[PDB]
RNA sequence: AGGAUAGUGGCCUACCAUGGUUUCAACGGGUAACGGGGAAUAAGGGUUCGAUUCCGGAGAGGGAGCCUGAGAAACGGCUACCACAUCCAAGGAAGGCAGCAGGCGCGCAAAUUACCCAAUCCCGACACGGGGAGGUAGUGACAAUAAAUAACGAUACAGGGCCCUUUUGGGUCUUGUAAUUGGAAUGAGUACAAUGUAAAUACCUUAACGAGGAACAAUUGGAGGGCAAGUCUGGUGCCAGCAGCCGCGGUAAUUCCAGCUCCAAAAGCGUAUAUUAAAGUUGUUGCAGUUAAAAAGCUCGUAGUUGAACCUUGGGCUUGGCUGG
């Protein structure tokens, strides 16, 4: 079609935005940036439709433009940055500090962090393989170029990003038993630890994973993000409601019982 | 009735963060005069007509024009 | 077995004979010929406008006797010339040689209706005016 | 067939029918007020004829 | 362009539009709750009608069915919540026994009549549409607004109305202060 | 094997083989054919539609060829040709609304040559500029929602309802009639004003004004049957006309033209065309084929469809979760 698309009808974006119908033709397209576009979450949407700071798209270049937004502690000003999966950001002057995690209804939620827990972040393995003059480096799920990893580091793993220098603390290694979030498809937002890996050479692996009430679901190797050593041991702290699916049933029982 | 409030901590601060049309309503500012958008868009494919100083363009045009 | 083939993998002669058998519908065969397109005067349309050529009057079938007053139209988007009923006591008057008028079927959908032979469409308008307005006076005839 | 005749004869009888002004009657009731006429009219005063009841009885 | 907004019909004609049974049970209906015309008559019947069909599906579902229990159970909540269930017919078996006339009990107009600040049930509509009636503190205007049980207590006079404690309306104020 | 391409590849060249598709329908033709998400109708199974708010594709009068660039065979870029077509001092020069608005033409068929970047977003060197993208209003009975056109009394007069009662005569409380009588209530409209908005309009609130024939006056179709509602009155007299169909009209026409009355739906109602259900009249569910339409004159027969029965059963032992009670 001649060249890259640069608008994002509004019925079009993606639906975690949870975007109204009515408000207008368009929607933010994310700019090119650590995470896929349909993965990512703009600024804009977080500052205005989230946090409700903003009244309109005119405040939230206002606000980034004064220099108070910070992601991965640095100053950022592009309105539509894709923010994605354990980005941290920074609005000192308000104080406080957000990790973007999904909840277990498959939207990003506002997961409020400790400032010690802001000074560090995850990264899913992607890749590890040989640069030029023969060093090793890891490709993290944003983007993230580490050179020099730990020899034991390899794919399917998480690496503890220091988010400060960008080196590695340390790592988990992809096995049997570790906490894991799926970041991808209808079990999106879940969480619970890996109970058998399926491989199927030249297809996509299957990962069996038990909920915290012992509920089983399968999902693609894409969408496993390793977060913890062992169940009840998150490297990062959770949303609420700890990533278990509750049936609307139970949830209707729940919420009356609340209220 | 039900609207929108805000409350900044200075009037400096309100001057810097608010729409101006709001400014006006409350008499802080004055509306500025500007020609109609037809008048505005008009003058700009008029100047894409002209390379180089208005100045120039209007003299060379002088000349041609021997009357 | 009922005449027709049963097995779970016969669909194709099922569907092939279902296909063939449903050009015996007329109907079906008038939809995908596009015989309207092709043979109705109207091209398929509801409506059409013409020129008024003559006030002629058709004679009724039996058993009945009377003069159904109708007028010949020549049709703008293809040329055509038709015969158009002219409704109610006295509006062939409101018809006159040479006017604008706008054509609708007779609601039988292509054939003639009652006792007057070889006719499928009624006038509604005339000079941009409608007949039935003419008739009660509520508007008059530009001229 | 044979299709001709005489076009003098239109608007014959509609011509001839001798005008009769409409009588400046009173308003009917619009609305929710007509529905109430009509309920009442067909089963509060009921003005049936021993199992002959009709809607608009000719005088007779 | 912009996304486009949702419409949907609420009523359905009846198939026959000539059917002396069918217009006669209408017009004795009509009477009976002061409606304007035939149309808030097919509204009942046309949500009634939907109402049938969604119980229907639950029905030939097996007893305890998610599917069923959820629904179900939310469908009789909302049904005894404006008071056209009875409290002791929470079984999905009167659902189906439901007639248009329980529905017609729980109108705006139905309860002002019903209430006794009116005379008759056509004295209730003009009150309702010349802004006298008031559900808690807010003023309704429409006749067909549905009461719940817990709004059914709340309904009177408008504060503001001649007869309600308000002021004196346009007419009287023309005669007194000659 | 090479060339070319960003790259695979008969994509092209040289040389060499004779292969490739097809009754399981190739190839060709038509399409009143852009595909899909979806729309209408729908017991089930289905039938019809999808130019059109989102996605993908294609095009910018018709072709073809290119420059720049990461990205275009771009057209609000260029080059050339074809068809239209503009100015000209006659030497020359300049075009592309299937962008917004608007005009002509075409037609049964579709709105303002309006305001603005305030919202939604996009672009730029960018907190600032630009955006007929977009939003606002105008026209707008496309469709959709709710919903006025009256309500309540008082007297009269009638009947029922009861009661004082044997009926009689009344007391009296529920209906119907009132050119037969009131005082209340309100928004359609208008309007100070505030709100609304970028600024307005409108909406929402709300002073004052704003309803008796409440002329602030509901219409569209019908009244033989189908199909609800006239054997009323006048006119015409196989004429005029009505009538989807059956039928009506020749001197009291239940059908025409009218008046009265009545019926149906109502801010909507009628007409034309298409389509869906009704249609078990396309039938897989689920038609028919002696005589209503319909077994090839008769055998053979390829593809197609369809094809007899049969192979670890029974028994025993423990074993968890549920569900009567
Ligand atoms: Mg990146
Ligand atoms: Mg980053
Ligand atoms: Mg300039
Ligand atoms: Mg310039
Ligand atoms: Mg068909
Ligand atoms: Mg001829
Ligand atoms: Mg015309
Ligand atoms: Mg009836
Ligand atoms: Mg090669
Ligand atoms: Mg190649
Ligand atoms: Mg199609
Ligand atoms: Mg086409
Ligand atoms: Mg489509
Ligand atoms: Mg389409
Ligand atoms: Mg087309
Ligand atoms: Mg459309
Ligand atoms: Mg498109
Ligand atoms: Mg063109
Ligand atoms: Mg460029
Ligand atoms: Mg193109
Ligand atoms: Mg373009
Ligand atoms: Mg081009
Ligand atoms: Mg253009
Ligand atoms: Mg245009
Ligand atoms: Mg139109
Ligand atoms: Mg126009
Ligand atoms: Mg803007
Ligand atoms: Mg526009
Ligand atoms: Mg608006
Ligand atoms: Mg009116
Ligand atoms: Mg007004
Ligand atoms: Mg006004
Ligand atoms: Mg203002
Ligand atoms: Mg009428
Ligand atoms: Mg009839
Ligand atoms: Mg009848
Ligand atoms: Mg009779
Ligand atoms: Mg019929
Ligand atoms: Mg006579
Ligand atoms: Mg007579
Ligand atoms: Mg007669
Ligand atoms: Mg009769
Ligand atoms: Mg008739
Ligand atoms: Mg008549
Ligand atoms: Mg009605
Ligand atoms: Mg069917
Ligand atoms: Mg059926
Ligand atoms: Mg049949
Ligand atoms: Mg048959
Ligand atoms: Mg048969
Ligand atoms: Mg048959
Ligand atoms: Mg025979
Ligand atoms: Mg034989
Ligand atoms: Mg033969
Ligand atoms: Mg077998």
Redesign the interface.
């Known amino acids: 079609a001649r060249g890259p698309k640069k608008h994002l009808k ?2 079009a974006a993606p639906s975690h935005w949870m975007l109204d ?2 408000s ?2 368009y929607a933010p397209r994310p700019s090119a940036g650590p995470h896929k576009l349909r993965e990512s979450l703009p600024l804009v949407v977080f500052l205005r439709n989230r946090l409700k700071y903003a009244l309109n798209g005119r405040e939230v270049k206002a606000i980034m433009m004064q220099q108070h937004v910070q992601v991965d502690g640095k100053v950022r000003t592009d309105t539509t940055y894709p923010a994605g999966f354990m980005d941290v950001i920074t609005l000192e002057a308000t104080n406080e500090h957000f990790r973007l995690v999904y909840d277990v209804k498959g939207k990003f939620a506002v997961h409020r962090i400790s400032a010690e827990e802001a000074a560090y972040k995850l990264g899913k393995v992607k890749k590890v393989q040989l640069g030029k003059k023969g060093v090793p480096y890891v490709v993290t799920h944003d983007g993230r170029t580490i050179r020099y990893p730990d020899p034991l580091i390899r794919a399917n793993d998480t690496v503890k990003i220091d988010l400060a220098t960008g080196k590695i603390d340390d790592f988990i290694k992809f096995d049997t038993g570790r906490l894991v979030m799926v970041t991808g498809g209808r079990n999106l937002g879940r969480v619970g630890v890996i109970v058998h890996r399926e491989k199927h050479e030249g297809g996509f692996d299957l990962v069996h994973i038990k909920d915290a009430l012992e509920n089983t679901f399968v999902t693609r190797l894409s969408n496993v993000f390793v977060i913890g050593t062992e169940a009840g041991k998150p490297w990062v702290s959770l949303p609420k409601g700890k990533g278990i699916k509750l ?3 139970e949830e ?1 029982d729940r919420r009356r019982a609340q209220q | 009735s039900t609207g929108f409030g805000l409350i900044y901590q200075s009037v400096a601060d309100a001057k810097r963060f608010e729409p101006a049309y709001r400014l006006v309503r409350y008499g802080l500012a004055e509306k500025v005069e500007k020609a109609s958008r037809q008048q505005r868009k008009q003058k700009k494919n008029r100047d894409k007509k002209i390379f180089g100083t208005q100045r120039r363009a209007q003299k060379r045009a002088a000349r041609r024009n021997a009357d | 077995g009922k005449g027709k083939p049963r097995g779970l993998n016969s669909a194709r002669k099922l569907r092939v004979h279902r296909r063939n058998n449903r050009w015996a519908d007329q109907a079906y065969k008038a939809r995908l010929l596009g015989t309207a397109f092709k043979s109705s005067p109207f091209g398929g349309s509801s409506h059409a406008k013409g020129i008024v050529l003559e006030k002629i009057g058709i004679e009724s079938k039996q058993p009945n006797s009377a003069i159904r007053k109708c007028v010949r139209v020549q049709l703008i988007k293809n040329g055509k010339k038709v015969t158009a009923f002219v409704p109610n006591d006295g509006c062939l008057n409101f018809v006159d040689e040479n006017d604008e008028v706008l054509l609708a079927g007779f609601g039988r959908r292509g054939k003639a209706k009652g006792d007057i032979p070889g006719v499928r469409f009624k006038v509604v308008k005339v000079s941009g005016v409608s007949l039935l307005a003419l008739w009660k006076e509520k508007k008059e005839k530009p001229r | 067939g044979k299709v001709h005749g005489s076009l003098a004869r239109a608007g014959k009888v509609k011509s001839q029918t001798p005008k009769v002004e409409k009588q400046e009657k009173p308003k009917k009731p619009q ?3 007509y ?2 006429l ?3 009219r ?2 509060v005063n009921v003005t049936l004829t021993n199992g002959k009841r009709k809607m608009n009885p000719s005088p007779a | ?3 486009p ?1 949702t419409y949907s019909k609420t009523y359905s004609v009846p198939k026959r539009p000539y059917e002396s049974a069918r217009l ?1 049970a209408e ?2 209906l ?2 009976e709750y ?4 035939k149309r808030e008559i097919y509204r009942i019947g046309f949500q009634l009608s939907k109402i049938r069909r969604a119980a229907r599906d639950l029905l030939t579902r097996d007893e305890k069915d ?1 599917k069923r ?2 629904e179900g159970n939310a469908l009789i909540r909302r049904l005894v919540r404006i008071g056209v269930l009875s409290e002791d017919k929470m079984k999905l078996d009167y659902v189906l026994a439901l007639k248009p006339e329980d529905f017609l009990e729980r109108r705006l107009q139905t309860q002002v009549f019903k209430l006794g600040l009116a005379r008759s049930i ?1 004295h209730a ?1 003009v009150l309702i549409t010349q802004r006298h009636i008031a559900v808690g503190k807010q003023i309704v205007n429409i006749p067909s607004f549905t009461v719940r049980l817990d709004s059914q207590k709340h309904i009177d006079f408008a504060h503001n109305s001649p007869y309600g404690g308000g002021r004196a309306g346009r007419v009287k104020r023309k005669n007194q202060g000659k």
Request: glycine share 10%; no cysteine.
């Open positions: 509004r019925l119908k009515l207008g033709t049936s609307i049933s209707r | 609305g929710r007020a529905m109430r009509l309920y009442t067909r089963f | 362009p912009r996304a907004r006669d017009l004795k009509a009477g002061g409606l304007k015309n998610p229990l959820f056509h509509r």
